[PDB]
Amino acid sequence: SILPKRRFTEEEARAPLPSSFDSAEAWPNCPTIPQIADQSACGSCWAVAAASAMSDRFCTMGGVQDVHISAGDLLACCSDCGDGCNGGDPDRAWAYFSSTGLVSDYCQPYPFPHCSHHSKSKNGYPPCSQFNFDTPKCNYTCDDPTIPVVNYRSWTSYALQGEDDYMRELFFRGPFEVAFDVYEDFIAYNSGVYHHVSGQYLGGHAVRLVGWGTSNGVPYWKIANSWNTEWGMDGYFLIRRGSSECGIEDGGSAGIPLAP
Ligand SMILES: *[C@@H]1O[C@H](CO)[C@@H](O[C@@H]2O[C@H](CO)[C@@H](O)[C@H](O)[C@H]2NC(C)=O)[C@H](O)[C@H]1NC(C)=O
Ligand code: NA
């Protein structure tokens, strides 16, 4: 990891964490948390999950109730992060949030429309396979140039590893970015607690971690996916917690938004 490891204070460390936890119920006055993103026909999961968590953390920590951080800005302008719509690194996305900063969804709206990721779309989105999107151009003015550019920054970035870090960080500071390996059997998930049993490896996938809990003696993470609200359980999925399922507990990325 390029980011420094998160160290917990003596007070944070000794906190008795609850058997279940939900970020939306923990910060009920933060409207960005329960919102689900759509990355569209682009490999921008690394950027979209980051911008979602940064938006959440401006409410949990930054003192701003409802600001949406522009995934598009991060996607296009962080060339050191990866190759835009062809994949990137969550760690470097958070490093960019502090060293340079990001505009809001209002300044630079996400350039790609809704599309269907699994199969059938009840709202009538075209298939995402129908679209082939290149990495958008990095812009330095708001799409509507008459809207002033407001730049949003964090003041620190750190990495996280393992069940306890994830839980402890989530509890104190809210949603952050994690990553895991996708297999064929994940694509059609719609219920239950996910566990890889069959299917070919497809690729890495960055996502936003919002909660934990236990269902019928099976501990799990509650995760916000970025395949719009029609995928999984209303945009979310549950995954096995405790034994790094698909490497979900191998690396997490987070930081603290600065009050502007
Ligand atoms: C930066 O602005 C440019 C130009 O306004 C955007 O590029 C256009 O994006 C639309 C919607 O995806 C496409 O239909 C056009 O073909 C693009 N035009 C050109 C000239 O590139 C771009 O999406 C913006 N970038 C971001 C990150 O918002
Ligand atoms: Na840990």
| Structure tokens belonging to residue 29 | 């006055």
Question: Which of these is catalytic: 30, 205, 228, 246?
Answer: 205
Pocket test for ligand 1, best of 40, 96, 139, 147 (most atoms within 8 A of CB): 139
Q: Is 45 a catalytic residue?
A: yes
What lines the ligand 1 site, CB under 6 Å? 72-73, 76, 108, 111, 136-137, 139
Give the closest residue to 53 by CA, choosing from 223, 167, 183. 223
CB atoms within 10 A of CB 219: 16
Distance linking the first and last C-alpha atoms of the chain: 28
CA distance 120 to 205: 22
| Structure tokens belonging to residue 258 | 């600065």
**Resolution in A, one decimal?**
2.5
- Residue 53, C-beta contacts closer than 8 angstroms, at least 6 positions apart: 174, 175, 176, 177, 208, 254
Helices 90-99/45-60 angle, 10° precision: 50
Ligand nearest to the CA of 168: 2
Please note each residue after which the chain is broken, C-to-N distance over 2.5 A, or write none: none
- Atom nearest to 111 CA in ligand 1: 12
Give the closest residue to 231 by CA, choosing from 201, 195, 187. 187
Give residue 168 CA to ligand 2 midpoint distance, Å. Answer: 9
Pocket test for ligand 1, best of 40, 85, 105, 137 (most atoms within 8 A of CB): 137
CB atoms within 10 A of CB 60: 20
Helices and strands per DSSP (H, E), number in the chain? 6, 8
Indicate the annotated binding residues for Mg(2+).
Answer: 11
CA distance 172 to 149: 31
- Residue 148, C-beta contacts closer than 8 angstroms, at least 6 positions apart: 142
20 within 8 A of 213, measured Cβ to Cβ:
yes
- The CATH H-level (homologous superfamily) assignment of domain 1-260 is Cysteine proteinases (3.90.70.10)
- Atom nearest to 77 CA in ligand 1: 27
Q: Is 205 a catalytic residue?
A: yes
What DSSP line would sit under 146-166, residue for residue? TSPP--B-EEEEEEE-SHHHH
**Secondary structure of residue 236 in the 3-state scheme:** strand
Give residue 59 CA to ligand 1 midpoint distance, Å. Answer: 29
The DSSP output letter for 177 is E
How far are the Cα atoms of 38, 59, 218 from residue 256, in angstroms, in the given order? 24, 11, 31
* Dihedral angle over CA of 141, 98, 114, 84, nearest 10: 80
| Structure tokens belonging to residue 77 | 């302008």
Q: Is 195 exposed, middle or buried (0-12, 13-18, 19+ CB in 10 A)?
A: middle
Q: Is 86 a catalytic residue?
A: no
* Dihedral angle over CA of 6, 12, 14, 15, nearest 10: -120
**Secondary structure of residue 167 in the 3-state scheme:** helix
Paired with 160 in beta bridges are 252
